[PDB]
CSV table of C-alpha atoms and ligand atoms in Angstrom, one decimal:
chain,number,residue,atom,x,y,z
A,1,UNK,CA,-11.8,43.5,-3.9
A,2,UNK,CA,-12.6,47.1,-4.9
A,3,UNK,CA,-12.7,50.0,-2.5
A,4,UNK,CA,-16.2,51.1,-1.7
A,5,UNK,CA,-17.4,54.0,0.4
A,6,UNK,CA,-17.8,52.7,3.9
A,7,UNK,CA,-20.8,54.2,5.8
A,8,UNK,CA,-19.5,55.0,9.3
A,9,UNK,CA,-22.7,54.1,11.1
A,10,UNK,CA,-22.9,50.6,9.5
A,11,UNK,CA,-22.4,47.8,12.0
A,12,UNK,CA,-22.0,44.8,9.7
A,13,UNK,CA,-19.1,42.5,10.6
A,14,UNK,CA,-19.1,39.7,8.0
A,15,UNK,CA,-17.0,41.3,5.3
A,16,UNK,CA,-13.3,41.8,4.4
A,17,UNK,CA,-11.7,44.0,1.9
A,18,UNK,CA,-8.4,43.5,0.0
A,19,UNK,CA,-8.0,46.8,-1.8
A,20,UNK,CA,-5.8,49.0,0.4
A,21,UNK,CA,-7.6,51.5,2.5
A,22,UNK,CA,-7.5,54.9,1.0
A,23,UNK,CA,-6.7,56.5,4.4
A,24,UNK,CA,-3.3,54.8,4.3
A,25,UNK,CA,-2.9,55.5,0.6
A,26,UNK,CA,-3.6,59.2,1.2
A,27,UNK,CA,-1.1,59.1,4.0
A,28,UNK,CA,1.5,57.7,1.7
A,29,UNK,CA,0.6,60.3,-1.0
A,30,UNK,CA,0.9,63.1,1.7
A,31,UNK,CA,4.3,61.6,2.8
A,32,UNK,CA,5.5,61.6,-0.9
A,33,UNK,CA,4.3,65.2,-1.3
A,34,UNK,CA,6.1,66.2,1.9
A,35,UNK,CA,9.2,64.4,0.7
A,36,UNK,CA,9.2,66.3,-2.6
A,37,UNK,CA,8.4,69.5,-0.7
A,38,UNK,CA,5.7,71.1,-2.8
A,39,UNK,CA,3.7,74.3,-1.9
A,40,UNK,CA,1.0,74.6,-4.6
A,41,UNK,CA,-0.6,71.3,-5.6
A,42,UNK,CA,-3.5,70.4,-7.8
A,43,UNK,CA,-5.9,67.5,-7.1
A,44,UNK,CA,-7.8,66.4,-10.2
A,45,UNK,CA,-10.5,63.8,-9.4
A,46,UNK,CA,-12.7,61.9,-11.9
A,47,UNK,CA,-15.5,60.5,-9.8
A,48,UNK,CA,-17.0,62.3,-6.7
B,1,UNK,CA,-20.4,62.2,2.6
B,2,UNK,CA,-20.3,66.0,3.4
B,3,UNK,CA,-17.4,66.5,1.0
B,4,UNK,CA,-19.8,65.2,-1.6
B,5,UNK,CA,-22.3,67.8,-0.4
B,6,UNK,CA,-19.9,70.7,-0.8
B,7,UNK,CA,-18.3,70.0,-4.2
B,8,UNK,CA,-18.9,73.4,-5.6
B,9,UNK,CA,-17.6,75.1,-2.4
B,10,UNK,CA,-14.5,72.9,-2.5
B,11,UNK,CA,-13.9,73.7,-6.2
B,12,UNK,CA,-14.5,77.4,-5.8
B,13,UNK,CA,-10.8,78.3,-5.2
B,14,UNK,CA,-10.4,77.6,-8.9
B,15,UNK,CA,-13.0,80.3,-9.7
B,16,UNK,CA,-11.9,83.0,-7.2
B,17,UNK,CA,-9.2,84.1,-4.8
B,18,UNK,CA,-10.9,82.4,-1.8
B,19,UNK,CA,-8.6,80.4,0.4
B,20,UNK,CA,-10.2,77.4,2.1
B,21,UNK,CA,-9.2,75.2,5.1
B,22,UNK,CA,-11.2,72.1,5.7
B,23,UNK,CA,-11.5,70.3,9.0
B,24,UNK,CA,-13.5,67.3,10.1
B,25,UNK,CA,-15.5,66.9,13.2
B,26,UNK,CA,-14.5,64.0,15.5
B,27,UNK,CA,-16.7,60.9,15.8
B,28,UNK,CA,-17.5,61.7,19.4
B,29,UNK,CA,-20.0,64.5,19.8
B,30,UNK,CA,-18.4,66.1,22.9
B,31,UNK,CA,-14.8,66.1,21.4
B,32,UNK,CA,-15.3,69.4,19.6
B,33,UNK,CA,-13.3,71.2,22.3
B,34,UNK,CA,-9.7,70.4,20.9
B,35,UNK,CA,-10.8,71.1,17.3
B,36,UNK,CA,-12.4,74.4,18.3
B,37,UNK,CA,-9.2,75.2,20.1
B,38,UNK,CA,-7.5,75.2,16.7
B,39,UNK,CA,-10.1,77.9,15.8
B,40,UNK,CA,-8.5,80.0,18.5
B,41,UNK,CA,-5.0,79.0,17.3
B,42,UNK,CA,-5.3,79.7,13.6
B,43,UNK,CA,-7.3,82.9,14.2
B,44,UNK,CA,-10.0,81.7,11.8
B,45,UNK,CA,-13.2,83.7,12.1
B,46,UNK,CA,-15.2,82.6,9.1
B,47,UNK,CA,-16.5,79.1,9.7
B,48,UNK,CA,-19.0,77.2,7.6
B,49,UNK,CA,-20.7,74.4,9.5
C,101,LIG,C1,-7.0,49.4,12.1
C,101,LIG,O1,-7.8,50.6,11.8
C,101,LIG,C2,-7.7,51.6,12.8
C,101,LIG,C3,-8.7,52.7,12.5
C,101,LIG,O2,-8.2,53.6,11.5
C,101,LIG,C4,-6.2,52.1,12.8
C,101,LIG,O3,-6.1,53.2,13.8
C,101,LIG,C5,-5.4,54.3,13.3
C,101,LIG,O4,-4.1,54.1,12.9
C,101,LIG,C6,-3.4,55.2,12.4
C,101,LIG,C7,-2.0,54.7,11.9
C,101,LIG,O5,-2.0,53.3,11.8
C,101,LIG,C8,-3.3,56.3,13.5
C,101,LIG,O6,-2.6,57.4,12.9
C,101,LIG,C9,-2.2,58.8,13.2
C,101,LIG,O7,-2.4,59.8,14.2
C,101,LIG,C10,-1.2,60.2,14.9
C,101,LIG,C11,-1.6,61.1,16.0
C,101,LIG,O8,-2.9,61.7,15.7
C,101,LIG,C12,-2.5,62.2,17.0
C,101,LIG,O9,-2.8,63.4,16.2
C,101,LIG,C13,-4.2,63.8,15.7
C,101,LIG,C14,-4.2,65.3,15.3
C,101,LIG,O10,-5.5,65.5,14.8
C,101,LIG,C15,-5.4,63.4,16.7
C,101,LIG,O11,-6.6,63.3,16.0
C,101,LIG,C16,-5.0,61.9,17.3
C,101,LIG,O12,-6.1,61.4,18.1
C,101,LIG,C17,-3.7,62.0,18.1
C,101,LIG,O13,-4.0,63.2,18.9
C,101,LIG,C18,-0.3,60.8,13.9
C,101,LIG,O14,0.9,61.3,14.5
C,101,LIG,C19,0.0,59.7,12.8
C,101,LIG,O15,1.0,60.2,11.8
C,101,LIG,C20,2.0,59.3,12.1
C,101,LIG,O16,1.7,58.8,10.7
C,101,LIG,C21,1.9,59.7,9.5
C,101,LIG,C22,1.9,58.9,8.2
C,101,LIG,O17,1.8,59.7,7.1
C,101,LIG,C23,3.2,60.7,9.6
C,101,LIG,O18,3.1,61.8,8.6
C,101,LIG,C24,3.3,61.2,11.1
C,101,LIG,O19,4.3,62.2,11.2
C,101,LIG,C25,3.5,60.1,12.0
C,101,LIG,O20,4.5,59.4,11.3
C,101,LIG,C26,-1.3,59.2,12.1
C,101,LIG,O21,-1.8,60.2,11.3
C,101,LIG,C27,-4.7,56.7,14.0
C,101,LIG,O22,-4.6,57.5,15.1
C,101,LIG,C28,-5.5,55.4,14.4
C,101,LIG,N1,-6.8,55.8,14.9
C,101,LIG,C29,-8.0,56.3,14.4
C,101,LIG,C30,-8.1,56.7,12.9
C,101,LIG,O23,-8.9,56.4,15.2
C,101,LIG,C31,-5.3,51.0,13.1
C,101,LIG,O24,-3.9,51.4,12.9
C,101,LIG,C32,-5.5,49.8,12.1
C,101,LIG,N2,-4.5,48.7,12.2
C,101,LIG,C33,-4.3,47.8,13.2
C,101,LIG,C34,-5.1,47.8,14.5
C,101,LIG,O25,-3.4,47.0,13.0
């Protein structure tokens, strides 16, 4: 139910996730930024 | 995981005037030819691998 870091070389296939994938969330955030038409943004991240 | 490995290099535009453009290798090993074509399109000559 929480997003975890997916290892790309893992081949397990007996799991599902219900948190939205952060690729699509980052695409939505990029679309929102392009809609508001910024030029100089600041990304502040808490955990690595 | 490599963005974890280069946290200080990513955050270094806060310290200095360095401008940074970050690109990802494709999953296929031989598909570097379109990506490297962007290197000839953006005229970028200082690449960190
Ligand atoms: C299950 O998971 C799959 C794995 O991620 C999903 O496949 C991926 O889907 C996304 C969207 O659903 C695909 O998205 C985008 O790529 C196109 C084209 O990329 C073209 O340009 C790239 C340039 O580097 C190349 O790398 C590509 O190979 C290709 O040359 C973009 O045009 C898209 O943008 C569209 O979406 C954004 C949203 O913000 C807009 O801004 C754009 O203007 C346009 O509206 C996407 O970025 C992705 O290609 C695809 N494959 C991967 C990651 O390998 C799959 O969708 C998912 N769901 C199922 C099956 O239901």
